[PDB]
Enzyme design. Structure first.
Site, PDB file in Angstrom:
ATOM      1  N   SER A 146       0.850  -1.171   0.000  1.00  0.00           N
ATOM      2  CA  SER A 146       0.000   0.000   0.000  1.00  0.00           C
ATOM      3  C   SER A 146       0.893   1.230   0.000  1.00  0.00           C
ATOM      4  O   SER A 146       2.053   1.145   0.393  1.00  0.00           O
ATOM      5  CB  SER A 146      -0.938  -0.005   1.192  1.00  0.00           C
ATOM      6  OG  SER A 146      -1.774   1.143   1.211  1.00  0.00           O
ATOM      7  N   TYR A 159      -4.085  -0.108   9.763  1.00  0.00           N
ATOM      8  CA  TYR A 159      -3.776  -0.493   8.394  1.00  0.00           C
ATOM      9  C   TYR A 159      -2.349  -0.085   8.023  1.00  0.00           C
ATOM     10  O   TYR A 159      -1.621  -0.869   7.425  1.00  0.00           O
ATOM     11  CB  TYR A 159      -4.829   0.160   7.494  1.00  0.00           C
ATOM     12  CG  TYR A 159      -4.804  -0.246   6.030  1.00  0.00           C
ATOM     13  CD1 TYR A 159      -5.345  -1.457   5.611  1.00  0.00           C
ATOM     14  CD2 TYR A 159      -4.323   0.618   5.053  1.00  0.00           C
ATOM     15  CE1 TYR A 159      -5.376  -1.811   4.271  1.00  0.00           C
ATOM     16  CE2 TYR A 159      -4.341   0.274   3.708  1.00  0.00           C
ATOM     17  CZ  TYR A 159      -4.875  -0.941   3.317  1.00  0.00           C
ATOM     18  OH  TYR A 159      -4.882  -1.287   1.995  1.00  0.00           O
TER      19      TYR A 159
END
Lengths: 258, 258
Positions: A146, A159
């Site tokens: 990510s 996250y």
């Protein structure tokens, strides 16, 4: 010419969580390149839905019900695949969740569940496939990272921690299993135009993304499949422990100023 | 006086976790020398007591607490007792942690998860617990003790690298999310530290550290206390979301070749 071989012909590929979305796009691309493709999801309905969607695209995929945080179930899934299809040549750790909650308000259990799905589970699936790859002295592990592997944002502490974790997991698997002709790399997606975000392009949010991206656009999910095929193929055999950002220039750019 | 060059910590309440000995103790002791009211925890009473005595011999009156940093309710009770006995925590150093050494493919999921929990989940739990008062005061410092394994992998230490990779990104995220309250979250990444534990290695291992380190030596633990004080002080208020590597040059250097 092994060095320009982008074919996956005959390779067995497992992409976690690939009943839809980016995983489904990556798996479909692997099938297009000759791979035998496997995937999991969390219940029979999702896997059924996945299987039909693959079948509508002319792909005979292999779908399993599996929770990637349960090591006994993961190992049994890999065991089956090995017997019915072939030992896994290509693993894509794609299954994942996001929560958006201010860190100071986030339940300990919820933070830990994000870490468990987004960091612990990739380790578990990797661990399950590595014996047979070591044995064959060949293997590819691709971790879907990510931009939150590099940059933080409000509401996504768990996250970001997970994704920063996954990045170092990629580098460690490279370091530890590289000597077996196993390459473990990352894909870090930029802003992907998914159906759910369509109303954000119908726009202030759209403007912010477009200004932030040198390419001046959202990415189509399919723009990740080229990078994914590359990392999964013999052509990338010297690429190892690397996060391949596919972001249209976002992480390279300070941003469009007024 | 000149707040920009204010390296003093007079009055500030500091919690350094696991600071009964080693790097934690060195940092906590430096905090005290700079005027801080210092608290620490360890896992059992025997460690707390020995910790307290070591502070007392150095002329430092510390507050020591028996606490498991993975037990959220206990962390909350500790933080609240600190608030009653000493004052609301102004400086947190997330220092307590463990290392396991085991090939990843052979590592139990339980053990992997435990490393992540102590070295990544617990820093989140303790930061969560101290942020309320820092937000109300519009002042705060959170220093995470990261690692060279926040950047680089090695055989046997997959779980540790992942945790430290995660902690790097948790540092960036807390900056992103809480910086607006005049709270600074940063990291310290130590290099090779010459501890009593690493005494045997000082020798072929010594030559390896000496070869890889531009400085050409191990670091004394106290050499982390300058950086720690800097990050905990008003002098560093513009530094936010940053991993300060204190490694004598290791990460910058490709290494000594024959």
């Amino acid at each position: 010419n092994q060095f320009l071989n982008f074919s996956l012909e005959g390779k067995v590929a497992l992409v976690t969580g690939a009943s839809y979305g980016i995983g489904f796009a990556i798996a479909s691309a692997f099938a297009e390149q000759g791979a035998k493709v496997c995937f999991n999801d969390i219940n029979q309905e999702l896997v059924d839905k996945g299987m039909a969607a693959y079948a509508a695209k002319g792909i005979k995929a292999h779908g399993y019900v599996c929770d990637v945080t349960d090591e006994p179930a993961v190992q049994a899934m890999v065991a089956t695949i090995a017997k019915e299809v072939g030992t896994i040549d290509i693993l894509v750790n794609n299954a994942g969740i996001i929560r958006r909650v201010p860190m100071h308000e986030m339940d300990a259990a919820d933070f830990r569940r994000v870490i468990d799905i987004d960091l612990n589970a990739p380790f578990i699936v990797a661990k399950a496939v590595l014996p047979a790859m070591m044995e064959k002295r060949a293997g590819k592990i691709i971790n879907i990272c990510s931009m939150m592997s590099e940059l933080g944002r409000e509401t996504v502490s768990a996250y970001a921690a997970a994704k920063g974790g996954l990045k170092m997991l990629t580098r460690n698997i490279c370091s530890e299993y590289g000597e077996y002709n196993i390459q473990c790399n990352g894909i870090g997606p930029g802003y992907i135009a998914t159906p759910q975000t369509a109303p954000l392009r119908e726009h202030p949010f759209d403007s912010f993304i477009c200004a932030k991206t040198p390419a001046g656009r959202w990415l189509d999910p399919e723009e990740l499949t080229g990078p994914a095929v590359f990392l999964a193929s013999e052509a990338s055999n010297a690429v190892n422990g690397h996060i391949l950002y596919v972001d249209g220039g976002i992480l390279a750019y300070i941003g469009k100023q007024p």
